């Protein structure tokens with residue numbers, strides 16, 4: 024039980040990290056930076072025509088609960 | 089039948105895998121040394137990674153375990169395709185099967201039997217590819233297959249379909265013997281044999 | 286000669302002495318005083334769990350204050366140049382003239398991402414755009430200094446032969462030549478941290494990492510058994526020298542799997558395979574367990590210890606809370622005070638993530654990793670890349686990754702090669718050691734505590 | 746004794762087929778490592794098995810001889826004893842719990858409470 | 859002109875750029891753009907909104 028919970032948590036965390044990485048590299052087109060505040064700028068992308076946004080917000084909601 | 093089912097299943101799986109690998113019936117590159125194949129294996133045995141062979145052997149072992157209630161002998165044949173002649177015969181005895189604990193001891197016995205089998209197979213000459221294939225033969229006590237379809241077998245679930253497809257997949261049929269060590273444990277009283285030429 | 290000749294020369298000439306088996310030699314006592322003292326720095330509350338900007342601000346302020354103090358200690362008034370007088374500037378836009386000036390401000394570079402990791406992440410996002418377009422659409426290779434008021438192109442030669450990563454605070458002092466590009470003559474670094482005094486019978490420490498015990502590689506188990514036999518004094522037979530290894534330090538990567546497709550059975554098998562080795566090594570030599578990037582723990586840097594579970598039931602006598610000096614499960618970063626010697630060990634995720642980028646400046650060898658480690662030690666920041674390494678809510682108003690006290694030895698693991706480097710910064714002495722993986726080229730590092738001399742042990 | 750050891754070795758080699766190591770002999774006979782190596786060499790003297798020998802060079806280097814024909818740095822060899830005897834070709838040992846109540850040559854400074 | 863030529867659903871700038879030019883452009887709310895334009899520090903936000911509008915203008919061509 025505990026091992027399965029840990030595995031699920033690790034999968035969710037890896038998915039969230041991959042989504043954050045791809046969104047940050049996507050916003051790199053505008054910021055042209057890779058350091059800090061890049062994810063902060065990319066954290067406001069509310070484009071409803073991109074499926075990565077829905078997956079990212081779903082992962083965030085799942086991690087917040 | 090509570091726990092000997094899985095143990096006999098993994099034993100037959102390792103048996104078939106080692107037989108197929110050490111006799112060069114399939115390319116060794118398709119085999120990999122592993123320990124988990126949906127069941128904890130007692131030794132790092134070379135198991136194939138092909139889907140068709142996987143469920144093929146799975147259904148074979150399932151039918152064998154279902155018929156175990158009347159089967160007392162299980163043989164794996166190795167025959168050539170240019171001529172339908174038996175070249176090698178590996179026998180696995182099931183004398184009364186000690187039918188109706190310490191799983192580590194069962195795993196140790198299975199490991200010893202598999203090591204004896206590998207030692208016996210290592211002394212055989214190299215076997216070539218190109219249609220050096222294998223078969224399967226069983227010996228029951230009192231049973232008759234191929235006659236359950238006399239009422240059209242109106243199906244209602246998956247169990248009946250599996251029973252029908254298992255009872256219909258069998259067809260009736262008609263040197264240096266080398267004995268090996270089997271499993272001398274209480275619940276699993278299994279013996280091993282072998283044939284050549 | 287043949288193997289038979291060597292066997293007849295060695296086994297027949299066996300001494301068969303000193304093996305009393307009733308009065309054995311006691312291992313050298315080595316105690317990590319940081320076990321129960323106070324203030325576990327990297328121990329966070331998982332239940333507590335953006336704060337990245339808050340952390341950025343505090344880090345920038347601390348770094349700015351330290352850089353200002355270093356400038357006051359180095360570029361104080363009366364530090365005249367060759368011909369011109371030196372001056373100070375508060376804003377980056379203030380330095381404009383034929384006079385040298387010193388200013389503080391962050392560094393900004395390109396720091397492009399690697400293409401391998403790009404496709405590796407792309408293959409698992411369910412319809413993401415071509416990230417390769419994000420780098421190719423733009424027209425690159427230039428270092429600038431941002432001080433919240435502007436950016437100036439830092440052109441020069443002394444910057445070329447130095448490594449840099451965006452987000453570092455530098456107090457370089459130069460002078461413009463023909464445009465809005467400031468030259469460089471010297472480079473300043475923040476004030477030196479206080480270091481514990483080196484103490485003046487003595488033992489050694491064994492460091493091993495990169496085990497990666499998986500259900501597919503059987504050679505790893507053979508190497509593990511060989512290492513267990515060699516540490517037990519059964520292989521070398523030189524008890525006078527083997528008993529000097531007080532404890533073993535597993536830095537990380539003991540179990541290696543792909544979290545995408547794994548079940549509970551494989552992890553349990555690998556943990557029980559490790560448990561055996563553990564049960565054979567424990568009653569002879571102490572052990573220090575540390576997690577890693579491929580271990581069943583958090584993927585961020587400050588990883589909590591694994592658990593009380595995930596080990597064989599026969600190890601319950603060690604998890605009773607009383608026998609902690611025999612086996613100690615610690616976080617990923619830790620500052621071990623081995624008999625007064627402060628050594629910091631990290632899983633190597635920081636250096637691996639820094640190398641995961643492609644910087645189009647600064648001109649994967651051993652010297653490059655050593656230089657990156659030296660820069661990390663000088664910058665007093667263990668994690669230079671915040672979002673790729675660090676996680677949310679690391680600390681409140683006091684970051685743990687910013688260095689507060691310089692250690693004696695900096696131990697990094699999960700590296701392809703092995704190497705050492707003794708760096709001198711502000712009259713201090715730091716010895717960086719690169720621990721390689723145990724799966725491929727499974728070398729064993731033996732670190733002494735009397736002269737800080739590292740030795741290697743190969744196992745084939 | 747050289748009599749019970751050979752009996753146990755041939756039993757665990759032919760009756761219950763499994764690779765035998767000097768550690769098992771030390772645990773069964775309660776003897777030292779050098780005595781175990783001497784007994785292993787004596788059993789190698791006076792054949793349906795495969796010997797696995799290891800050689801410890803200088804600089805704390807340990808390797809496993811595989812070709813048994815080209816031994817590099819034969820002058821730097823400080824010790825060379827037979828490690829195990831396996832009847833099969835693939836080594837692949839197995840490890841279990843061992844109760845070293847009195848078969849330990851190096852004891853830790855701390856005792857389990 | 860895009861609706862008369864192409865046959866899609868959203869009829870937005872980002873959807874058109876992704877379905878015609880194969881380029882996905884992020885989208886920010888008006889409040890975020892205003893907060894980025896009125897930041898005395900953090901020139902990254904100014905560069906971000908500048909490149910945003912420049913790309914929105916070049917995609918029109």
Ligand code: SF4
Nearest residue numbers: 046049068073075076
């Ligand atoms: S999701 Fe928002 S950020 Fe991530 S790619 Fe699509 S647009 Fe760019």
